PDB file of C-alpha atoms in Angstrom:
ATOM      1  CA  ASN A   1     147.027 282.161  15.262  1.00  0.00           C
ATOM      2  CA  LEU A   2     147.134 278.331  14.973  1.00  0.00           C
ATOM      3  CA  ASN A   3     150.741 278.210  15.996  1.00  0.00           C
ATOM      4  CA  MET A   4     150.803 279.032  19.724  1.00  0.00           C
ATOM      5  CA  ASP A   5     147.755 276.777  20.508  1.00  0.00           C
ATOM      6  CA  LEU A   6     149.698 273.568  19.311  1.00  0.00           C
ATOM      7  CA  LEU A   7     153.166 274.613  20.420  1.00  0.00           C
ATOM      8  CA  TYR A   8     151.991 275.144  24.059  1.00  0.00           C
ATOM      9  CA  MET A   9     150.462 271.736  24.056  1.00  0.00           C
ATOM     10  CA  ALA A  10     153.717 270.253  22.738  1.00  0.00           C
ATOM     11  CA  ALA A  11     155.710 271.815  25.443  1.00  0.00           C
ATOM     12  CA  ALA A  12     153.206 270.739  27.939  1.00  0.00           C
ATOM     13  CA  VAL A  13     153.297 267.064  26.758  1.00  0.00           C
ATOM     14  CA  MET A  14     157.098 267.142  26.785  1.00  0.00           C
ATOM     15  CA  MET A  15     157.464 268.521  30.385  1.00  0.00           C
ATOM     16  CA  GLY A  16     154.555 266.371  31.794  1.00  0.00           C
ATOM     17  CA  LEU A  17     156.291 263.230  30.673  1.00  0.00           C
ATOM     18  CA  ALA A  18     159.590 264.489  31.961  1.00  0.00           C
ATOM     19  CA  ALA A  19     157.948 265.288  35.312  1.00  0.00           C
ATOM     20  CA  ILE A  20     156.725 261.689  35.477  1.00  0.00           C
ATOM     21  CA  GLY A  21     159.920 260.215  34.593  1.00  0.00           C
ATOM     22  CA  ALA A  22     162.127 262.106  36.818  1.00  0.00           C
ATOM     23  CA  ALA A  23     159.999 262.002  39.906  1.00  0.00           C
ATOM     24  CA  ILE A  24     159.366 258.206  39.682  1.00  0.00           C
ATOM     25  CA  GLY A  25     163.070 257.410  39.089  1.00  0.00           C
ATOM     26  CA  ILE A  26     164.226 259.547  41.889  1.00  0.00           C
ATOM     27  CA  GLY A  27     161.372 258.215  44.164  1.00  0.00           C
ATOM     28  CA  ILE A  28     162.555 254.627  43.641  1.00  0.00           C
ATOM     29  CA  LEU A  29     166.301 255.500  44.020  1.00  0.00           C
ATOM     30  CA  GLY A  30     165.641 257.522  47.181  1.00  0.00           C
ATOM     31  CA  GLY A  31     163.551 255.048  48.665  1.00  0.00           C
ATOM     32  CA  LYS A  32     166.322 252.442  48.309  1.00  0.00           C
ATOM     33  CA  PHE A  33     168.894 254.920  49.609  1.00  0.00           C
ATOM     34  CA  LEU A  34     166.788 255.500  52.660  1.00  0.00           C
ATOM     35  CA  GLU A  35     166.277 251.983  53.322  1.00  0.00           C
ATOM     36  CA  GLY A  36     170.098 251.540  53.133  1.00  0.00           C
ATOM     37  CA  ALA A  37     170.680 254.421  55.475  1.00  0.00           C
ATOM     38  CA  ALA A  38     168.195 252.988  57.929  1.00  0.00           C
ATOM     39  CA  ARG A  39     170.010 249.603  57.746  1.00  0.00           C
ATOM     40  CA  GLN A  40     173.504 250.908  58.216  1.00  0.00           C
ATOM     41  CA  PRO A  41     173.840 254.349  59.894  1.00  0.00           C
ATOM     42  CA  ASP A  42     177.436 255.829  59.819  1.00  0.00           C
ATOM     43  CA  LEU A  43     177.529 254.954  56.199  1.00  0.00           C
ATOM     44  CA  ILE A  44     175.011 257.780  55.285  1.00  0.00           C
ATOM     45  CA  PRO A  45     177.798 259.997  53.597  1.00  0.00           C
ATOM     46  CA  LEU A  46     179.083 257.211  51.433  1.00  0.00           C
ATOM     47  CA  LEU A  47     175.674 256.129  50.436  1.00  0.00           C
ATOM     48  CA  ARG A  48     174.667 259.678  49.745  1.00  0.00           C
ATOM     49  CA  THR A  49     177.810 260.073  47.516  1.00  0.00           C
ATOM     50  CA  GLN A  50     176.737 257.038  45.464  1.00  0.00           C
ATOM     51  CA  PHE A  51     173.113 258.230  45.395  1.00  0.00           C
ATOM     52  CA  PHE A  52     174.334 261.415  43.823  1.00  0.00           C
ATOM     53  CA  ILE A  53     176.341 259.405  41.359  1.00  0.00           C
ATOM     54  CA  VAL A  54     173.112 257.684  40.232  1.00  0.00           C
ATOM     55  CA  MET A  55     170.770 260.506  40.496  1.00  0.00           C
ATOM     56  CA  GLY A  56     172.987 262.465  38.078  1.00  0.00           C
ATOM     57  CA  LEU A  57     172.472 259.921  35.495  1.00  0.00           C
ATOM     58  CA  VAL A  58     168.670 259.436  36.214  1.00  0.00           C
ATOM     59  CA  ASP A  59     167.645 263.090  35.436  1.00  0.00           C
ATOM     60  CA  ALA A  60     169.655 263.504  32.167  1.00  0.00           C
ATOM     61  CA  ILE A  61     166.909 262.830  29.475  1.00  0.00           C
ATOM     62  CA  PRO A  62     164.200 264.382  31.651  1.00  0.00           C
ATOM     63  CA  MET A  63     166.419 267.547  31.874  1.00  0.00           C
ATOM     64  CA  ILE A  64     167.104 267.590  28.155  1.00  0.00           C
ATOM     65  CA  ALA A  65     163.339 267.356  27.856  1.00  0.00           C
ATOM     66  CA  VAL A  66     162.637 270.223  30.378  1.00  0.00           C
ATOM     67  CA  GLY A  67     165.241 272.461  28.595  1.00  0.00           C
ATOM     68  CA  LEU A  68     163.640 271.894  25.217  1.00  0.00           C
ATOM     69  CA  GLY A  69     160.119 272.220  26.517  1.00  0.00           C
ATOM     70  CA  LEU A  70     161.073 275.740  27.824  1.00  0.00           C
ATOM     71  CA  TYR A  71     162.891 276.391  24.621  1.00  0.00           C
ATOM     72  CA  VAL A  72     159.657 275.819  22.842  1.00  0.00           C
ATOM     73  CA  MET A  73     157.572 277.701  25.196  1.00  0.00           C
ATOM     74  CA  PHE A  74     159.635 280.990  25.416  1.00  0.00           C
ATOM     75  CA  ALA A  75     161.855 280.734  22.145  1.00  0.00           C
ATOM     76  CA  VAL A  76     159.534 279.384  19.530  1.00  0.00           C
ATOM     77  CA  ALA A  77     156.147 280.370  21.074  1.00  0.00           C
TER      78      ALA A  77
ATOM     79  CA  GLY B   1     177.504 245.984  66.066  1.00  0.00           C
ATOM     80  CA  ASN B   2     176.913 248.655  63.493  1.00  0.00           C
ATOM     81  CA  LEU B   3     173.363 247.569  63.695  1.00  0.00           C
ATOM     82  CA  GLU B   4     171.328 246.497  66.864  1.00  0.00           C
ATOM     83  CA  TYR B   5     168.136 245.112  67.913  1.00  0.00           C
ATOM     84  CA  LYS B   6     166.014 245.413  71.255  1.00  0.00           C
ATOM     85  CA  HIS B   7     165.670 241.752  72.266  1.00  0.00           C
ATOM     86  CA  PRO B   8     164.661 241.323  75.907  1.00  0.00           C
ATOM     87  CA  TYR B   9     167.633 239.241  76.801  1.00  0.00           C
ATOM     88  CA  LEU B  10     170.117 242.031  76.361  1.00  0.00           C
ATOM     89  CA  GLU B  11     168.726 244.837  78.544  1.00  0.00           C
ATOM     90  CA  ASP B  12     169.226 245.147  82.292  1.00  0.00           C
ATOM     91  CA  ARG B  13     165.701 245.312  83.504  1.00  0.00           C
ATOM     92  CA  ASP B  14     164.795 245.644  87.281  1.00  0.00           C
ATOM     93  CA  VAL B  15     165.657 242.652  89.299  1.00  0.00           C
ATOM     94  CA  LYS B  16     162.599 241.410  91.230  1.00  0.00           C
ATOM     95  CA  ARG B  17     163.672 237.716  91.459  1.00  0.00           C
ATOM     96  CA  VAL B  18     166.491 235.687  90.366  1.00  0.00           C
ATOM     97  CA  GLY B  19     166.917 232.054  89.122  1.00  0.00           C
ATOM     98  CA  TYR B  20     169.788 229.704  89.224  1.00  0.00           C
ATOM     99  CA  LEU B  21     170.830 226.512  87.158  1.00  0.00           C
ATOM    100  CA  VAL B  22     172.689 224.312  89.339  1.00  0.00           C
ATOM    101  CA  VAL B  23     175.179 221.666  88.300  1.00  0.00           C
ATOM    102  CA  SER B  24     175.865 218.887  90.640  1.00  0.00           C
ATOM    103  CA  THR B  25     177.555 215.358  90.561  1.00  0.00           C
ATOM    104  CA  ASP B  26     175.485 212.185  90.433  1.00  0.00           C
ATOM    105  CA  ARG B  27     178.136 210.274  92.361  1.00  0.00           C
ATOM    106  CA  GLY B  28     179.621 210.770  95.926  1.00  0.00           C
ATOM    107  CA  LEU B  29     183.179 210.449  96.989  1.00  0.00           C
ATOM    108  CA  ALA B  30     184.085 213.665  95.140  1.00  0.00           C
ATOM    109  CA  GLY B  31     185.415 215.307  98.222  1.00  0.00           C
ATOM    110  CA  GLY B  32     184.241 218.720  99.067  1.00  0.00           C
ATOM    111  CA  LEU B  33     183.251 219.483  95.516  1.00  0.00           C
ATOM    112  CA  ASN B  34     179.547 219.916  95.965  1.00  0.00           C
ATOM    113  CA  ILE B  35     179.361 221.345  99.355  1.00  0.00           C
ATOM    114  CA  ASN B  36     181.776 224.230  98.673  1.00  0.00           C
ATOM    115  CA  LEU B  37     179.549 225.037  95.666  1.00  0.00           C
ATOM    116  CA  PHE B  38     176.325 224.823  97.576  1.00  0.00           C
ATOM    117  CA  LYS B  39     177.557 226.998 100.269  1.00  0.00           C
ATOM    118  CA  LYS B  40     178.685 229.656  97.932  1.00  0.00           C
ATOM    119  CA  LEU B  41     175.233 229.419  96.311  1.00  0.00           C
ATOM    120  CA  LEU B  42     173.590 229.698  99.625  1.00  0.00           C
ATOM    121  CA  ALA B  43     175.625 232.801 100.661  1.00  0.00           C
ATOM    122  CA  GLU B  44     174.682 234.693  97.317  1.00  0.00           C
ATOM    123  CA  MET B  45     170.953 233.644  97.761  1.00  0.00           C
ATOM    124  CA  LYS B  46     171.186 234.958 101.200  1.00  0.00           C
ATOM    125  CA  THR B  47     172.316 238.244  99.938  1.00  0.00           C
ATOM    126  CA  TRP B  48     169.611 238.378  97.295  1.00  0.00           C
ATOM    127  CA  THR B  49     166.816 237.490  99.686  1.00  0.00           C
ATOM    128  CA  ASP B  50     167.917 240.136 102.097  1.00  0.00           C
ATOM    129  CA  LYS B  51     166.986 242.836  99.453  1.00  0.00           C
ATOM    130  CA  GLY B  52     163.606 241.110  99.258  1.00  0.00           C
ATOM    131  CA  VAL B  53     163.989 239.567  95.804  1.00  0.00           C
ATOM    132  CA  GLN B  54     163.119 236.042  95.713  1.00  0.00           C
ATOM    133  CA  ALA B  55     165.302 233.239  94.370  1.00  0.00           C
ATOM    134  CA  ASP B  56     164.634 230.227  92.205  1.00  0.00           C
ATOM    135  CA  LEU B  57     166.469 226.994  91.222  1.00  0.00           C
TER     136      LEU B  57
END
């Protein structure tokens, strides 16, 4: 009936915007991380540590969004 | 350092000819100062020209 049509679209919008956000945020952050690694090799491990420190914060809201889109898809519809 | 660049002045390219900058006095009565130096230079330039590499001054 009318439900699944719109619910699938809602999950679709949710996870599409999540994919845009996480991909672009990590692209910028990784680009700066790679320029820093090219600038100063032998610091790759420390910069990678910091890169993960930030990447963990970047993907939070996108991952709540992914989780709730999957919830809607396979729990509600 | 931790970083490096590849400027020509830092790499030991093949020696095909050599140049010298020579410092000498403008006034005599210095004793053997100039001739000792010029004899040393001439010996090293002899060595270099033996290997067929030119020299420049």
